[PDB]
RNA sequence: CAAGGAACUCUGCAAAUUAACCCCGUAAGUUAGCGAGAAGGGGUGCUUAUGUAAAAGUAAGCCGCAGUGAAGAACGAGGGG
RNA sequence: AGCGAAAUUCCUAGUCGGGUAAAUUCCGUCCCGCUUGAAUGGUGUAACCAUCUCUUGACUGUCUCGGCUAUAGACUCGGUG
RNA sequence: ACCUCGAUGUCGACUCAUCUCAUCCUCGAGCUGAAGCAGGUUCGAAGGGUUCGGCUGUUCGCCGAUUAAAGAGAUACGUGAGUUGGGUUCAAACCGUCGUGAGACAGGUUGGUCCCUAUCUAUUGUGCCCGUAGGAAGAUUGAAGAGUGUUGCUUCUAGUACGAGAGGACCGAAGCGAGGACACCUCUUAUGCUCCAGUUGUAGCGCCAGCUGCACCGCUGGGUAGUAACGUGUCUAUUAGAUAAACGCUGAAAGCAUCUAAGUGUGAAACUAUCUCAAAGAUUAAUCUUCCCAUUUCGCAAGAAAGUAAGAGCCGUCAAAGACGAUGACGUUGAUAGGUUACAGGUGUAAGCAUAGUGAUAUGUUGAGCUGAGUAAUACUAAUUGCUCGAGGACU
């Protein structure tokens, strides 16, 4: 007769990963993507950082931005998405938990990383 | 349209709420619209909890919204409150104020209700 | 058809992951374990239906007509009672489970009430076009334009009955069919489904057999991440 | 958007027939008389079990 | 938004840089050109030293969408620029030098040669 | 207000964009008076030294996604009468 | 003389060409040219025009495609009316 | 030559369009000088749909590219108490012509002013009163109504049959679908005006520090819940009957035969059902059960005092609904709203301290701090120690 709507988390506790280290939108990562031709799943690496982290609980989707052949690809990955394995390369600096200026910032520079 | 009174703008209403939360500290009684009093009660309880924290940083936070009157200077008023009334009501889970609906105003049916403090 | 029906309430709305790597939004509906109030048939009561009761209450939380019939029915008091037409399988004084009415992957529909939002504009209730903004807009610039259907004597000179003029839009009886039954939970008596659900958290939910695809069933599995740390 | 004929007195009386003011509930002050409006204070300057103000 | 004269980039060795959507040949009121859609376009800027001309109505295929779109898996594909390529009404590119990567939402409808000359398959 | 960016409209009508300063840079016609603010681009914060009398002005460092961070300040080119 | 399909020309979408997927818009060609035409001034000229005016870089929520917020109204309550 | 000048608003464009078929297509069918396909003709046929732009005031018209077609007509070439005044028909100014001049041009040219506070009805929603023959409750019902009665592409069938070669099927199945109808803010986008962070200066807060007001919400960057789209998700088949055209069998007249006159099937997106929403004032106010009462006694047992005992209403905590009304939950027996506690999200290392530098500054404290609306408990505050009505079965 009395509900909780925290049992929503109880049923969500079946679709989660338990490997991803803590990240704060600016730690550079390399997410490997399992993609098929028809079979023999190949690896598509996607090196970048979290431009925007949006959602609620399981809905926490995060942007990852890469540049290939001068083309900027920004793609909204999910933390617990199958075949979306995130490898954390390094950690930068967190001015704020969200960034809206990587589009106005160019490459060729050593991005700041914590020592 | 063009030039007229602002009415109930957010800045206007927040300033008026600040005036009422200063006056309730000044005199201990407020007689106003019940619609204003019900919203004032929320921030009054929040400020009561903040006073119960009773920190110098809390002094800075409370300083932001208090206003000065003729007889109650801010330095005297806030120090007095934090000295005695901050722990006075420290044994109650909310409901730090109550509104009693009085008779309305004489002229234009302006509902007068009294907001006061309670345990 | 021998309609299978259950009563539940929406308790949230989110997404989930699946096997075969597709995104699957989740409307989560807690289905109440219902006790049947009775059965009517078209040959005995002239309308085939099953009366169900839910939202159990105490002896002092109901009007004495309904409560008195309900204790005469030998059923512990409940807030709400509703009949489902063409349903006769479930008879009075028995428990209703979500695992027998339907199966994991077949297609159903849900009768529900929309969310209360009051009056909405004609451009929203009927999806018309707004007037001009540039080249001079004037004060009235949002309307459907002309209402005249003819000038002069005996052309139209009026607006007949039954016109789609804006009014109360929302909080209305709706039903969307062919939505996937994503997940079952008999331990919690709960259902995860796909799509978008009308109404707020508290809107009535009546699950029934889909008219477009009653028996069509599709396979799908959830995604359980086995990626070790 | 203006009228062509005057409104009759009988029709306006029928229109004003549905017009009615608000309904007022009553209660009693807990330590004074003067039947008051429900959820409102009476003129005895005393709300029931109360006496914070004056009666002028 | 796909509409009349949607200026977008060119990603093949053709010698053109500005082309505008003049017609979307297909269903009525579609008013969108999803990834892989072949659309009727009028060329705005093209050098004669290249292998293309200007003004003539041709057919082109959008390869990049700056707003992006939702994929069937759940990850939102997105770019930062509108771009297209010029096709010769087949599964092969007019410009042999295909600049930039390609998506995987248009291989099921042919275009194997264009994706073959792409720098990567993603 | 993302996104196409004039397709809406008889027609870019309204709005939009520019805006203080200095640093460069500026074409054709021409009566040499003009064009011209042509057009086209950069940037200004704080601390230290140098700084002249205040200055401007420069260098070193430090940070912001951004530095007349509030304000008020210039859109332009070609065609025809 | 000169001008010109000149806003002056019904035929005009004049014949041709340019900007023109598209362009009775615009500008170049010729002069029977209803009703061109040299102090009704004509032909051009240098600048300028809150002048007409063709095209355009940005420019924009005009349109695409309508939407979010806010007050003041509208509406409720009260007084006047 | 008239109903209509004590006036009788007409062009376009927009918005909304609805109605009809001599129907453009989606559909069915016959014939063909219809191999197939492409088709054409004709018959039925309104269920639905039938483009975008540029120039031209433009309904007229021209051009280009498309889908299945980019149908027509009517509504004062529908409609300005709905919008603009592009245009038509304003003075004015100008070119050319005419008129001596006033001025005119069924010539061009430049711009050329759309008021209306809804009384009634017609209508869309929302309410109140009464009633349906004791009250009330639902569960209904469905008479009457409506929405819905759109469609294309690819592949397999199949280069198969056919055809000759070439050319190339009729149907079905799978996927993709475009459009619009409905719902949502979980994926994405904007807003998010008492959220956070940072920043500019002025006025201040007695100063450093830190805090506030003002300044396009000061600006900048976001953003909780929420709002919505530019975003997601279902939808176009189908069933039963009778079908139009049309295809039929048998069969009489006209001994044979002949879709019709008898008997008698098949067959279109047309019609009525299945799909969906509401629905007994539907005075035809329909059904069912339910709970309460039928309360000795005094004129009809006439209110005679006990006027439901079912409860409802007033009022309030309110949003669940939401201009108000009203709907709905809840009234101390309660978590009904608020507050408190803690959590989630957002937001982003709080203040202050140590550190080195003269100072800007940077390392740790610190993912700390804050939070309108999110989450679970808390009777802590406010729904009063409140009020009124409410059946005797009206009449056999």
Swiss-Prot record, chain A:
It comes from the Bacteria. Keywords: Ribonucleoprotein, Ribosomal protein. GO terms for molecular function: structural constituent of ribosome. The keyword Ribonucleoprotein applies. InterPro entries: Ribosomal_bL19, Ribosomal_bL19_CS, Ribosomal_bL19_sf, Translation_prot_SH3-like_sf. The keyword Ribosomal protein applies. One of its GO terms (biological process) is translation. Pfam families: Ribosomal_L19. GO terms for cellular component: cytosolic large ribosomal subunit. This protein is located at the 30S-50S ribosomal subunit interface and may play a role in the structure and function of the aminoacyl-tRNA binding site. Belongs to the bacterial ribosomal protein bL19 family. PANTHER family: LARGE RIBOSOMAL SUBUNIT PROTEIN BL19M, RIBOSOMAL PROTEIN L19. This is Large ribosomal subunit protein bL19. It comes from Mycoplasma pneumoniae (strain ATCC 29342 / M129 / Subtype 1) (Mycoplasmoides pneumoniae). The gene is rplS.
Swiss-Prot record, chain B:
GO terms for molecular function: structural constituent of ribosome. The keyword DNA damage does not apply. One of its GO terms (biological process) is translation. Part of the 50S ribosomal subunit. Contacts protein L32. It comes from the Bacteria. Disulfide bonds: none annotated. InterPro entries: Ribosomal_bL17, Ribosomal_bL17_CS, Ribosomal_bL17_sf. This is Large ribosomal subunit protein bL17. PANTHER family: LARGE RIBOSOMAL SUBUNIT PROTEIN BL17M, RIBOSOMAL PROTEIN L17. Belongs to the bacterial ribosomal protein bL17 family. GO terms for cellular component: cytosolic large ribosomal subunit. Keywords: Ribonucleoprotein, Ribosomal protein. PROSITE patterns: RIBOSOMAL_L17. Pfam families: Ribosomal_L17 (PF01196).
UniProtKB/Swiss-Prot annotation, chain C:
The keyword rRNA-binding applies. This is Large ribosomal subunit protein uL3. One of the primary rRNA binding proteins, it binds directly near the 3'-end of the 23S rRNA, where it nucleates assembly of the 50S subunit. The keyword Isomerase does not apply. One of its GO terms (molecular function) is rRNA binding. It comes from the Bacteria. One of its GO terms (cellular component) is cytosolic large ribosomal subunit. Keywords: Ribonucleoprotein, Ribosomal protein, RNA-binding, rRNA-binding. Signal peptide: none annotated. Part of the 50S ribosomal subunit. Forms a cluster with proteins L14 and L19. The lineage of its organism: Bacteria, Bacillati, Mycoplasmatota, Mycoplasmoidales, Mycoplasmoidaceae. Belongs to the universal ribosomal protein uL3 family. GO terms for biological process: translation.
UniProtKB/Swiss-Prot annotation, chain E:
One of its GO terms (molecular function) is large ribosomal subunit rRNA binding. One of its GO terms (biological process) is translation. Coiled coil: none annotated. The keyword Ribosomal protein applies. Pfam families: Ribosomal_L14. Keywords: Ribonucleoprotein, Ribosomal protein, RNA-binding, rRNA-binding. Transmembrane segments: none annotated. GO terms for cellular component: cytosolic large ribosomal subunit. Part of the 50S ribosomal subunit. Forms a cluster with proteins L3 and L19. In the 70S ribosome, L14 and L19 interact and together make contacts with the 16S rRNA in bridges B5 and B8. PANTHER family: 50S/60S RIBOSOMAL PROTEIN L14/L23, LARGE RIBOSOMAL SUBUNIT PROTEIN UL14M. Belongs to the universal ribosomal protein uL14 family. NCBIfam families: rplN_bact. Binds to 23S rRNA. Forms part of two intersubunit bridges in the 70S ribosome. This is Large ribosomal subunit protein uL14.
């Amino acid at each position: 007769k009395i509900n909780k709507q925290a049992l929503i988390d109880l049923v969500e506790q079946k679709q989660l990963k338990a490997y991803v280290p803590e990240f704060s939108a600016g730690d550079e990562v390399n997410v490997a993507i399992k993609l098929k031709e028809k079979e023999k799943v190949r690896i598509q690496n996607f090196t970048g950082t979290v431009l925007r982290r949006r959602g609620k609980g399981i809905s926490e989707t995060f942007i990852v931005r890469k540049t290939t052949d001068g083309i900027p690809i920004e793609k909204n990955f999910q933390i617990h998405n199958p075949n979306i394995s995130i490898e954390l390369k390094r950690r930068g600096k967190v001015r704020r938990a969200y960034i809206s200026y990587m589009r106005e910032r160019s490459g060729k520079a050593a991005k700041i990383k914590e020592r | 349209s063009y030039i007229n009174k602002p009415g109930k703008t957010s800045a206007w209403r927040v300033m008026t709420v600040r005036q009422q939360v200063s006056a309730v500290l000044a005199y201990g009684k407020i007689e106003t619209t019940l619609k204003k009093a019900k919203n004032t009660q929320k921030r009054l309880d929040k400020l009561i909890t903040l006073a119960k924290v009773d920190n110098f940083n809390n002094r800075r936070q409370v300083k932001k919204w208090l206003l000065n009157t003729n007889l109650f200077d801010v330095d005297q008023l806030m120090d007095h409150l934090f000295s005695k009334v901050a722990p006075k009501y420290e044994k109650t889970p909310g409901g730090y104020s109550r509104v009693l609906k009085l008779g309305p105003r004489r002229g234009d049916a302006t509902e007068m209700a009294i907001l006061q403090l309670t345990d | 058809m021998e309609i299978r029906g259950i009563f539940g309430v929406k308790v949230g709305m989110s997404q989930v992951f699946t096997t075969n790597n597709e995104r699957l939004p989740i409307t989560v509906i807690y289905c109440e374990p219902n006790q049947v109030a009775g059965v009517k048939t078209e040959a005995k009561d002239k309308y085939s239906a099953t009366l169900l009761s839910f939202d159990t209450v105490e002896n002092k939380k109901l009007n004495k007509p309904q409560q008195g019939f309900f204790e005469k029915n030998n059923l512990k008091p409940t807030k709400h009672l509703q009949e489902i037409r063409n349903m006769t399988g479930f008879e009075m004084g028995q428990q209703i489970t979500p695992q027998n009415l339907f199966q994991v992957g077949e297609y159903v529909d849900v009768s529900a009430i929309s969310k209360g939002r009051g009056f909405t504009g004609a451009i929203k209730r009927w999806n018309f076009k707004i007037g001009p903004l540039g080249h001079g807009a004037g004060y009235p610039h949002r309307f459907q334009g002309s209402v005249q259907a003819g000038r002069g004597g005996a052309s139209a000179q009026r607006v007949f009955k039954g016109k789609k003029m804006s009014g109360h839009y929302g909080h209305e009886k709706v039903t969307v069919q062919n939505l996937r039954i994503v997940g079952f939970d008999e331990a919690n008596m709960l259902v995860l489904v796909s799509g978008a659900i009308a109404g707020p958290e508290g809107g009535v939910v009546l699950i029934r057999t889909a008219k477009k695809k009653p028996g069509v069933v599709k396979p799908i599995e959830l995604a359980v991440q086995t990626e070790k740390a | 958007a203006v009228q062509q004929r005057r409104s009759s007195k009988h029709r306006r009386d029928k229109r004003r027939s549905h017009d009615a003011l608000t309904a007022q509930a009553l209660s009693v002050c807990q330590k004074c008389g003067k039947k008051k409006l429900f959820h409102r204070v009476c003129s005895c300057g005393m709300y029931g079990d109360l006496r914070v103000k004056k009666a002028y | 938004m796909v509409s009349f004269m949607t200026r977008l980039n060119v990603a093949d060795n053709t010698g053109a840089k500005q082309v505008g959507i003049i017609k979307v040949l297909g269903s009525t009121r579609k008013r969108y050109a999803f990834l892989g859609d072949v659309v009727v376009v009028s060329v705005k800027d093209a050098i004669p030293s290249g292998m293309v001309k200007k003004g003539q109505v041709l057919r082109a295929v959008i390869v990049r969408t700056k707003k992006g779109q939702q994929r069937k898996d759940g990850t939102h594909l997105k770019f930062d620029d509108n771009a297209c390529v010029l096709i010769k009404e087949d599964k092969s590119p007019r410009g042999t030098r295909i600049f930039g990567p390609v998506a995987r939402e248009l291989r099921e409808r042919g275009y194997n040669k264009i994706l073959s000359l792409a720098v990567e398959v993603v």
